[PDB]
């Protein structure tokens, strides 16, 4: 979990990111409203915000 404790099933929004040999990745895929597509660095945030 986000502390480092066990991420039980109810630890939905409570976990770290996911590591690889040389790299890490956060696992939730952020999607613009309706688009089913994905944002860029130079993309403003409101397009996704819940």
């Amino acid at each position: 979990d986000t502390d480092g404790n066990a991420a039980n099933g109810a630890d939905y929004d409570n976990v770290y990111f996911e590591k690889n040999g040389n790299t890490v990745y956060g696992n939730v895929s952020q999607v613009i409203k309706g688009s089913n597509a994905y944002a860029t660095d130079s993309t403003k945030l409101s397009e996704v915000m819940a």
Binding site: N20, G21, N22, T23
Partner: protein, 50 residues
């Protein structure tokens, strides 16, 4: 530990020294190899095969 001399596609030279854990699969190495080259996932410089 692993010790290295390398010279880059432009031609500039570089040495390297890095640790190796016993259970390094080649994939684990082939994950570092990108960083070791500067062959970052963001910018390829070489393509490898075994």
């Amino acid at each position: 530990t692993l010790y290295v001399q390398g010279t880059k596609p432009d031609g500039t030279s570089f040495k390297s020294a890095v640790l190796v854990k016993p259970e390094d699969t080649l994939e684990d190495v082939m994950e570092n190899i990108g960083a070791l080259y500067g062959n970052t996932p963001n910018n390829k410089v070489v393509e490898v095969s075994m």
